[PDB]
Amino acid sequence: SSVKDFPKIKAIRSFIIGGVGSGGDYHNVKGGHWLIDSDISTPASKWEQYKKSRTSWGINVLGSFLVEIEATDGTVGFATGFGGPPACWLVHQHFERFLIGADPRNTNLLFEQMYRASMFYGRKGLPIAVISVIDLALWDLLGKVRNEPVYRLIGGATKERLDFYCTGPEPTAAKAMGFWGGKVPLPFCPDDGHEGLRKNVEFLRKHREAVGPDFPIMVDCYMSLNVSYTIELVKACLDLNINWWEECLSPDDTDGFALIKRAHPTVKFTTGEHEYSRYGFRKLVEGRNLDIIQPDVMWLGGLTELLKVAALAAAYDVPVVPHASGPYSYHFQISQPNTPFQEYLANSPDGKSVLPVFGDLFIDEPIPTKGYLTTADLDKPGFGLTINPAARAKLIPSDYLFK
Amino acid sequence: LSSVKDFPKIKAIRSFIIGGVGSGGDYHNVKGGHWLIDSDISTPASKWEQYKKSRTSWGINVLGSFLVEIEATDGTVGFATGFGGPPACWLVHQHFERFLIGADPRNTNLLFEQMYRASMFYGRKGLPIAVISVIDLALWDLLGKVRNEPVYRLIGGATKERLDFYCTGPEPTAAKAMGFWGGKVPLPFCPDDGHEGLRKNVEFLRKHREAVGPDFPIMVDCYMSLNVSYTIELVKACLDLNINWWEECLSPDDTDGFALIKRAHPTVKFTTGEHEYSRYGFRKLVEGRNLDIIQPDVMWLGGLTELLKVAALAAAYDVPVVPHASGPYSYHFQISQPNTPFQEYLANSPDGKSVLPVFGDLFIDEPIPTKGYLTTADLDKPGFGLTINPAARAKLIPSDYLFK
Amino acid sequence: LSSVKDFPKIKAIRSFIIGGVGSGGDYHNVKGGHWLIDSDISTPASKWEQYKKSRTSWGINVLGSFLVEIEATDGTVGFATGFGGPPACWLVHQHFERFLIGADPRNTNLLFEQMYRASMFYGRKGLPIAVISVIDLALWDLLGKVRNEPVYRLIGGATKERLDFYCTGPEPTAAKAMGFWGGKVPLPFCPDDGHEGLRKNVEFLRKHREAVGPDFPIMVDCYMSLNVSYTIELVKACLDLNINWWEECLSPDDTDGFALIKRAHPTVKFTTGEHEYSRYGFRKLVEGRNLDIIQPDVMWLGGLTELLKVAALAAAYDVPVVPHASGPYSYHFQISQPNTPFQEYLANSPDGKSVLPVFGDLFIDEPIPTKGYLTTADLDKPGFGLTINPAARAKLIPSDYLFK
Amino acid sequence: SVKDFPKIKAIRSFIIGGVGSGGDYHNVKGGHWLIDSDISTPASKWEQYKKSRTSWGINVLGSFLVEIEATDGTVGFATGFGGPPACWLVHQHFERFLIGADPRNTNLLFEQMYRASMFYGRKGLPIAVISVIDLALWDLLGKVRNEPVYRLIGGATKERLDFYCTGPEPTAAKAMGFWGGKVPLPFCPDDGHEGLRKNVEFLRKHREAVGPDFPIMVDCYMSLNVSYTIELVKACLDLNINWWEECLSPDDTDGFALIKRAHPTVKFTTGEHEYSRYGFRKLVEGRNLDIIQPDVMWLGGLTELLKVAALAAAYDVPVVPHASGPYSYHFQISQPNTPFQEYLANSPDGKSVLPVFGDLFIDEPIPTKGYLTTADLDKPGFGLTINPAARAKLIPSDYLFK
Ligand SMILES: [Mg+2]
Ligand SMILES: [Mg+2]
Ligand SMILES: [Mg+2]
Ligand SMILES: [Mg+2]
């Protein structure tokens, strides 16, 4: 009588995305893509048979999945992420019980229940990725019911333009397209010894020469190094003026950054894409040994938990720059006090062009073909992503997993 | 783009000083006789005989209350009240209005950051921040009204369907009888009264404990009037009384002192925060985890936008946030977060034996916990659900005269 | 080579979901009425009414149990069970099988590092690690069978000839009567039940202390359901009950909180760890030496291979390791290390008054501590000494359907 | 039912006569660089003990061998330094814990020997004795099972083991295939600034001889101090030294916190003269050491080494044992945090690879090409067979009890 009668959650559906290159799993791409077939230092590079390809050790094992949440009024919110079959299984077997019949505006409650109820087998990893996509679907639903973009529901626009840096093998392409900086993947791991270190130095030197003395260059190490190696490598590259070194250490050793900072206190280091929950991120802010924390919105717990993570970081003026994530990150970056810019993970096989982060799953993903986006690009209900009707044929119902 | 709601922009902002007393955000600008100002209460000024008997003697009621109205281009008006009076209104128009006119009210994060950083040279804490807080609350009231939704449904929904209250006042037996889960009494004597005062404080608490029985929770408010050594000795002298928690024992300037207090009484709970401001001020109270509960006042710390960030920081360490009784502004907040367990109700009756509106006759529909609790249904009104009493309109003094 | 044993390589790996309930590694996937799911137990979900009376209500039994079989080229088959069900089986074949086929099963260190580091992008803790744990245990079972030796004789031998147990369940008088050295009871109410819940918790523990006498050791399991302040107050309220130790008082996400708990109760023992994973996860529980005992679950933390490394680190600080239940997988470990003093047995009888197989009817010869202890002789069988019940194989659901 | 494992029937001890044979690396013939070249040591402070390491007694103990025979006739053995006093302790103290025991009870036997000798041990000689006994137990276990020790402690984490060479000729190390060369620091702090400049020139010459890329490490044999180390390292920054080894006395590992404050981008190592899991935990705490280097024959043995490596692994600190031959090879090839092996050049001039234990064994696998593979280690136990010729040099320890 006095306030809006908000529709409640009626049902939840999940699908696995058939094929590759479509959906939230960044690394479930076709062979030849630099993301899986170029020289990239990884936790498995220690072993020859898992050194030449990231798919060899299973970086693409999970695949992508999609969650749809339908309200009693017919409005449907959705989101995608990596997790595939196992994720869909958990969606229905465990989390559905908390959603059906609930007021979707109760984001704080739903997250706490899903998180604490799965604590015995979760807290980090796959289960949290599942909660993340469910939470993102809820926000998409809330935006659509109110007919407002998600960013207008979480603080508004703190900026009217979102500037991107490009992650890929071709920083000169990033520069030419308008991106403010380029992040390249380190090719060799510590096990390659000093030989690999010199090759790593040459690889970076070549890029620095190619883009000029001013273009910012960042280095992604995909949690593949160690303290001693990181310190030696960074020292060897001091004249290359690297902007920052990303995820040098395993997510299990964030304590190691106190040691890295002791050695290179004037050098920037970042990490976080493989960390989860507000409890996990509080440790990355503690000690302030990380210049930027980079959670993945589809992995850390979702938008609801991300808002809390950013608030804690904001109390220490630590910037939050999410790992890729597309619109799920765009709506977040454009609305907070401490979210300076955005990352775009080059999704073209050669890293020379900008293609949709989620492939052909959606038909209207806003892309930074000129290195940036504006609030206008995000002025669509929810997260603004419309499922490509032609992609429905590729959406496999998860029903078979329960037969 | 036309693909989404066309939200109205901010058209104008108005401010008023609330005439008289007992109405508005200033809890302490009340009529003489009210225990809030005329009972024995230890304060930072109790050190001096002429300022020990009443809190008004030294100026606790000097500012008064003020009201801010923010009107959107569609005619919708959001508002909020708080303490600050004339000087607060002066700042609203002279400094902050420039950031508001023509802005999208949904840009709460941007507007807060601009007002806070732009007033940093004379603010960061205190009066200027209280001004920003009331403006921010008015923005949220406006947002809820435009969307036709209660504020709590815009900041996380309901994490609980019922909000339980504890009652702050001189009569915990009344609090118990009314349904409140606990009672917080004000400490009567300050450190300068010496050991006699300490004995009198102990006797004061002993009698309250005996009156409510051994199980009813009793908390003690010290209004930032003690010091480390006195707190340690007082707490020790009261161990057998089973005090639930000791509130604001130290000056807000010495939160570092709780490390020393915790070293002495690690099994005793301590709280503080009503006179702390910004996310930068509160990060300190969470650091070291020497405070069991942080208690910011929504109308003082910076507003709801900033409070949401303060609560999130505390939540990462599972530190509960229980705001200093701020009426609906705190109710909508407490009902929505994962670490906001209960609420405080500052007995506003002269004798502390009954529950009356926190903001007096300024509004006509303030939800009150006469039974010691409120429900989400009680909060189901647009914005903060407060409607100005048309009769109070006459008391609303335009701030225009301050610029003549 | 021609001078040493020609060890068979891994030929194939099979996984099965255990149909029904009460059989397999999932301790909580049991029939209704079992105290493990239907008694008053404080949990992380006890904050919500609809989830506080039953642990199955919020999903403690959602995963189910699964079995892994690893067959060597000589036809020898090693196997192990654990919780994880369908999703666990999916991962076994889709991700981990690639590292196992054709490998030398004696390369336990290599295989664990590969599975762990290759799944770090979505693992490090939780379900994925539980999968790796069961595969590792199956590898050890296989190694013992190929060499015709018990697993304990392959990881250090016997550091003791007898393994003493304490009993976890609602009836400590039964534990005492059956010969167990101590009894661990589950705390009934969570912090959200306030002071009333706290008084009830105290009365609950007092009743048990009264029942077993002043000398019988009583431990309290809190199933990661409390918080720092509540734990401190509860322990203080139970000081005269002489509780041996308080288990998993905090969420596994806040082990840092034990520093605060120890500051308040330095003479009281605290334990945790059943929901922590990897050597990297456990190194934190040993740092600061704020935990008197760490308790990993061998089927969850990463496996026996990783557990051996966790125990070695703890051993450098003389911190005892007492794994969570785990049956034979834990018995073989506890009997072989320098810092593994005793073992836990989770009373699996619906009323907690008798001891039954931990894995139910899945096996036909599980050694059980009916007298409160086991001996090295009880463990003298190839591998982990568990023989699959033929009648249970029909209950074994091939995971094949998950890939159709 | 299960295997009926043979129990320990007896234990025998022998002193290895002469020099150049056995576990005492430094009990060699005069002229060997190990004892007669310029090497900074704890005793370099005194002129009469400056020129040779034997002058102050680095070779005073000698080598000894322990044989443990099981009831089935199988015999496991190991060698180490300790000589006569070591043999005395083997029988007078430790034999009581071994006779009649199941050799598979490695954890129990180690704890009993260590804790029972705590009143006069914990570090040093007594621990070296326990180590050799423990190694003999593992040799026995592998032989009874007809498996290499590495297949009993985790398998192979690598199929190839790369070595770096310790000696005065890094160009020889490079030529032979070793990935790096570790040279001994010639002068101690007591030689003042003059000695420091000579140390710098000494290292510069080696760097210039092997080129800018070949890894060069510097061994300081626990002879320096904090201030001197800080000044020396600073003076050599342009030489790109890979790591500085055992700069401080084993009694002052706390000093590395100070060294790291000064040179946080420089690698430091130590540990060959540290013992037990309790001793090594301190080297891992603070993470001020980039590599810990216990000697398998001194720290307590393989059983304890496995625990030391596990603690280090929790912090990703690599463990690279000091020399040790097969006792270390089997360990390095099997752990997650044991990247490479050290080969202490035993040739007098340091230009060739000779057996670590001399002519004591007849089949010691040697890294003539700078590496070894799992195939080289595929022998029962530690794969060392006593040289029939050497049997004559095996002096029964019996005379020590008469
Ligand atoms: Mg990255
Ligand atoms: Mg107060
Ligand atoms: Mg437990
Ligand atoms: Mg050395």
Secondary structure of chain C in HEC code, one letter for each residue: CCCCCCCCCEEEEEEEEECCCCCCCCCCCCCCCCHHHHCCCCCCCCCCHHHCCCCCCCCCCCCCEEEEEEEECCCCEEEEEEECHHHHHHHHHHHHHHHHCCCCCCCHHHHHHHHHHHCCCCCCCCHHHHHHHHHHHHHHHHHHHHHCCEHHHHCCCCCCCEEEEEEECCCHHHHHHHCCCCEEEECCCCHHHHHHHHHHHHHHHHHHHHHHCCCCCEEEECCCCCCHHHHHHHHHHCHHHCCCEEECCCCHHHHHHHHHHHHHCCCCEEEECCCCCHHHHHHHHHHHHCCCEECCCCCCCCCHHHHHHHHHHHHCCCCCECCCCCCHHHHHHHCCCCCCCCEEEECCCCCCCCCCCCCHHHECCCCCCCCCEEECHHHCCCECCCCECHHHHCCEEEHHHHHC
The verdict on C126 and C158 lying in the same domain is no
CA of C274 to the centre of ligand 3 (A): 6
The verdict on D380 and D399 lying in the same domain is no
Distance from CA of B60 to the nearest CA of A (A): 30
Q: What does the alpha-carbon distance between residue B381 and residue C308 come to, in Å, rounded to a whole number?
A: 60
Q: Are B156 and B335 in contact (CB under 8 A)?
A: no
Query: Going by DSSP bridges, is the β-strand pair D371-373/B343-346 parallel, antiparallel, or unpaired?
Result: unpaired
What is the helix (H) or strand (E) element at residue D341, kind and residue range?
A: strand D341-344
Task: Locate C358 and state its tokens.
Answer: 């931990």
In total, the C-beta contacts within 8 angstroms joining chain A to chain C are 119
Q: What does the alpha-carbon distance between residue B172 and residue B243 come to, in Å, rounded to a whole number?
A: 13
User: Hey, how many other C-beta atoms are within 10 angstroms of the C-beta on D389?
Assistant: 10
Q: Using CB atoms, which chains have 3+ pairs under 8 A with D?
A: A, C
Task: Locate A197 and state its tokens.
Answer: 């270190």
Q: Are D250 and D222 in contact (CB under 8 A)?
A: yes
Query: Going by DSSP bridges, is the β-strand pair D371-373/D160-166 parallel, antiparallel, or unpaired?
Result: antiparallel
| Angle CA B260–B169–B57, to nearest 5 | 80
Query: Going by DSSP bridges, is the β-strand pair B373-375/C373-375 parallel, antiparallel, or unpaired?
Result: unpaired
Task: Locate A200 and state its tokens.
Answer: 């790593």
A304: Cβ contacts below 8 Å, ≥ 6 apart: A107, A108, A110, A111, A135, A139, B156
CB contact (8 A) between residue A262 and residue D264: yes
Q: What does the alpha-carbon distance between residue A1 and residue C99 come to, in Å, rounded to a whole number?
A: 62
Here the CATH number for the domain that contains residue D291 is 3.20.20.120
The verdict on D287 and D183 lying in the same domain is yes
Partnered with residue D373 across adjacent β-strands are D160
Which DSSP state fits A41? Answer: -
The length of chain C in residues reads 404
A170: Cβ contacts below 8 Å, ≥ 6 apart: A182, A346, A350, A351, A352
Which DSSP state fits B93? Answer: I
Query: Going by DSSP bridges, is the β-strand pair D8-16/C162-168 parallel, antiparallel, or unpaired?
Result: unpaired
Query: Which residue is listed with tokens 């993945």?
Result: A296
From D89, D81, D36, select the one nearest D61 (Cα to Cα). D81
What is the helix (H) or strand (E) element at residue A278, kind and residue range?
A: helix A277-285
Query: Going by DSSP bridges, is the β-strand pair B245-247/B218-221 parallel, antiparallel, or unpaired?
Result: parallel
Distance from CA of C25 to the nearest CA of D (A): 25
Q: What does the alpha-carbon distance between residue A132 and residue A91 come to, in Å, rounded to a whole number?
A: 11
Here the CATH number for the domain that contains residue A85 is 3.30.390.10
Q: What is the CA radius of gyration of chain B?
A: 21
Task: Locate B317 and state its tokens.
Answer: 């360490």
**3-class SS of residue D344:** strand
Q: Are B62 and B391 in contact (CB under 8 A)?
A: no
Residue B161, classified by CB atoms within 10 Å of its CB into exposed (0-12), middle (13-18) or buried (19+), is exposed
What is the helix (H) or strand (E) element at residue B147, kind and residue range?
A: helix B127-147
Position C60, amino acid: I
Position C16, amino acid: F
| Angle CA B291–B294–B295, to nearest 5 | 145
Q: Are C201 and C222 in contact (CB under 8 A)?
A: no
B157: Cβ contacts below 8 Å, ≥ 6 apart: A103, A105, A106, A107, A108, A109, B336
Q: Are A365 and A388 in contact (CB under 8 A)?
A: no
The verdict on A159 and A231 lying in the same domain is yes
Q: Are C251 and A282 in contact (CB under 8 A)?
A: no
The verdict on A252 and A374 lying in the same domain is yes
User: Hey, how many other C-beta atoms are within 10 angstroms of the C-beta on D225?
Assistant: 14
- Strand order across the beta sheet in which C65-72 lies: C77-83, C65-72, C10-18, C396-398
Q: What does the alpha-carbon distance between residue C354 and residue C366 come to, in Å, rounded to a whole number?
A: 15
Q: Are B327 and B356 in contact (CB under 8 A)?
A: no
From C129, B67, D315, select the one nearest A226 (Cα to Cα). D315
Compute the CA torsion angle C65, C70, C71, C76 (nearest 10 deg). Answer: -90
The verdict on B40 and B116 lying in the same domain is yes
CA of B61 to the centre of ligand 4 (A): 76
Query: Going by DSSP bridges, is the β-strand pair D216-219/D181-184 parallel, antiparallel, or unpaired?
Result: parallel
Q: Are C323 and C330 in contact (CB under 8 A)?
A: yes
From A295, A289, A294, select the one nearest A255 (Cα to Cα). A289
Position B278, amino acid: S
Q: Residues lining ligand 3 (ion), CB within 5 A?
A: C 221, 247
Q: What does the alpha-carbon distance between residue B70 and residue B79 come to, in Å, rounded to a whole number?
A: 6
Q: Using CB atoms, which chains have 3+ pairs under 8 A with B?
A: A, C
Chain mean position to CA D40: 19
Greatest CA separation for chain C = 73
Position D325, amino acid: G
Closest chain D residue to A250, measured at CA = D316
User: What is the domain extent for residue D5?
Assistant: 1-146+388-402
From A67, A74, A66, A68, select the one nearest A8 (Cα to Cα). A74
From B24, B145, B42, B184, select the one nearest B88 (Cα to Cα). B24
Which DSSP state fits D54? Answer: T
From C307, C305, C327, select the one nearest C315 (Cα to Cα). C307
Q: What does the alpha-carbon distance between residue A175 and residue A309 come to, in Å, rounded to a whole number?
A: 31
**3-class SS of residue D59:** coil
Alpha helices in D236-384, H assignment, sequence order: 256-262, 276-284, 302-313, 326-332
Return the axis-axis angle of helices A107-117 and A303-314, rounded to nearest 10°: 100
- Chain D residue numbers with beta carbons less than 8 Å from the beta carbon of C3 are 378-380
Q: DSSP string covering A144-176, please? A: HHHT-BGGGGTT--S-SEEEEEEESS-HHHHHH
C320: Cβ contacts below 8 Å, ≥ 6 apart: C292, C293, C294, C314, C339, C340, C341
Q: How many domains does chain C have?
A: 2
Q: What does the alpha-carbon distance between residue B295 and residue B282 come to, in Å, rounded to a whole number?
A: 10
User: Hey, how many other C-beta atoms are within 10 angstroms of the C-beta on A10?
Assistant: 16
Give strand ranges (E) for B42-195. Answer: 65-72, 77-83, 162-168, 183-186
Q: What are phi and psi of C183, to 5 degrees?
A: -130, 130
Q: What does the alpha-carbon distance between residue C347 and residue C325 come to, in Å, rounded to a whole number?
A: 10
- Chain C residue numbers with beta carbons less than 8 Å from the beta carbon of B262 are 263
Greatest CA separation for chain B = 73
Partnered with residue D161 across adjacent β-strands are D372
Residue A367, classified by CB atoms within 10 Å of its CB into exposed (0-12), middle (13-18) or buried (19+), is middle
User: Hey, how many other C-beta atoms are within 10 angstroms of the C-beta on C200?
Assistant: 14
CB contact (8 A) between residue D378 and residue C1: yes
CA of D44 to the centre of ligand 4 (A): 16
Q: What does the alpha-carbon distance between residue C192 and residue B76 come to, in Å, rounded to a whole number?
A: 40
The verdict on D172 and D310 lying in the same domain is yes
The closest CB to that of B279, out of A103, A148, A314, belongs to A314
User: Hey, how many other C-beta atoms are within 10 angstroms of the C-beta on C192?
Assistant: 16
Whether residue D322 lies in the annotated active site: yes
Q: What does the alpha-carbon distance between residue C67 and residue C403 come to, in Å, rounded to a whole number?
A: 17
Q: What does the alpha-carbon distance between residue C375 and residue C363 come to, in Å, rounded to a whole number?
A: 19
From C283, C344, C272, select the one nearest C310 (Cα to Cα). C283
Q: What are phi and psi of D56, to 5 degrees?
A: -90, 0
Identify the active-site residue in C28, C208, C324, C332: C324
B120: Cβ contacts below 8 Å, ≥ 6 apart: none
Task: Locate D358 and state its tokens.
Answer: 């001399």
Q: What does the alpha-carbon distance between residue D252 and residue C401 come to, in Å, rounded to a whole number?
A: 62
Task: Locate A50 and state its tokens.
Answer: 């898992």
Query: Going by DSSP bridges, is the β-strand pair A76-82/A64-71 parallel, antiparallel, or unpaired?
Result: antiparallel
Query: Which residue is listed with tokens 């060698």?
Result: D79
Residue A191, classified by CB atoms within 10 Å of its CB into exposed (0-12), middle (13-18) or buried (19+), is middle
Annotated resolution, angstroms: 1.9
Q: Are A104 and A139 in contact (CB under 8 A)?
A: no
Query: Going by DSSP bridges, is the β-strand pair D63-70/D8-16 parallel, antiparallel, or unpaired?
Result: antiparallel
Q: What does the alpha-carbon distance between residue C66 and residue C133 come to, in Å, rounded to a whole number?
A: 12
The verdict on A56 and A203 lying in the same domain is no
Greatest CA separation for chain D = 72
Q: What does the alpha-carbon distance between residue D117 and residue D124 come to, in Å, rounded to a whole number?
A: 12
CB contact (8 A) between residue D287 and residue A227: yes
From B132, B155, B153, B8, select the one nearest B76 (Cα to Cα). B8
Task: Locate A112 and state its tokens.
Answer: 């706490």
- Chain A residue numbers with beta carbons less than 8 Å from the beta carbon of D267 are 228, 232
Task: Locate C168 and state its tokens.
Answer: 């976890």
Task: Locate A309 and state its tokens.
Answer: 């993570």
Distance from CA of B52 to the nearest CA of C (A): 35
Q: What are phi and psi of A170, to 5 degrees?
A: -120, 85
Q: Are D96 and D106 in contact (CB under 8 A)?
A: no
| Cα–Cα distances in angstroms (integers) from residue D135 to residues A259, A360, B377, C363, D200, in the given order | 36, 62, 75, 39, 40
The verdict on C107 and C189 lying in the same domain is no
The verdict on C254 and C370 lying in the same domain is yes
| Cα–Cα distances in angstroms (integers) from residue D175 to residues A192, C57, D210, D346, D353, in the given order | 20, 70, 10, 16, 12
Which DSSP state fits B363? Answer: B
Which ligand neighbours the alpha carbon of C273 most closely? 3
Closest chain C residue to B341, measured at CA = C192
Q: What does the alpha-carbon distance between residue C379 and residue C332 come to, in Å, rounded to a whole number?
A: 7
Q: DSSP string covering D118-179, please? A: TTT-SSSHHHHHHHHHHHHHHHHHHHHHT-BGGGTTT--S-SEEEEEEESS-HHHHHHHT-S
Q: Are B18 and B65 in contact (CB under 8 A)?
A: yes
What is the helix (H) or strand (E) element at residue B199, kind and residue range?
A: helix B194-212
Q: Are B289 and B319 in contact (CB under 8 A)?
A: yes
Any contact of C with A, at least 3 CB pairs below 8 A? Answer: yes
CB contact (8 A) between residue A231 and residue D179: no
Q: Are B291 and B319 in contact (CB under 8 A)?
A: yes
| Angle CA B47–B49–B52, to nearest 5 | 75
Partnered with residue D4 across adjacent β-strands are none
Query: Which residue is listed with tokens 């456990």?
Result: C282
CB contact (8 A) between residue B113 and residue A156: no
Closest chain C residue to B216, measured at CA = C195
Q: What are phi and psi of D48, to 5 degrees?
A: -70, -10
| Method by which the model was determined | X-ray
Position B299, amino acid: M
| Angle CA C64–C69–C71, to nearest 5 | 170
Q: What does the alpha-carbon distance between residue D239 and residue D204 come to, in Å, rounded to a whole number?
A: 6
Return the axis-axis angle of helices B127-147 and B108-118, rounded to nearest 10°: 170
The verdict on D232 and D365 lying in the same domain is yes
Task: Locate C290 and state its tokens.
Answer: 């704020």
Classify the phi-psi angles of B98: left when phi > 0, otherwise alpha if psi is within -120 to 50, otherwise beta: alpha
From B258, B287, B288, select the one nearest B272 (Cα to Cα). B258
Q: Are D215 and D291 in contact (CB under 8 A)?
A: no
Q: Are A133 and A80 in contact (CB under 8 A)?
A: yes
The verdict on B177 and B221 lying in the same domain is yes
The closest CB to that of C380, out of D2, D303, D335, belongs to D2
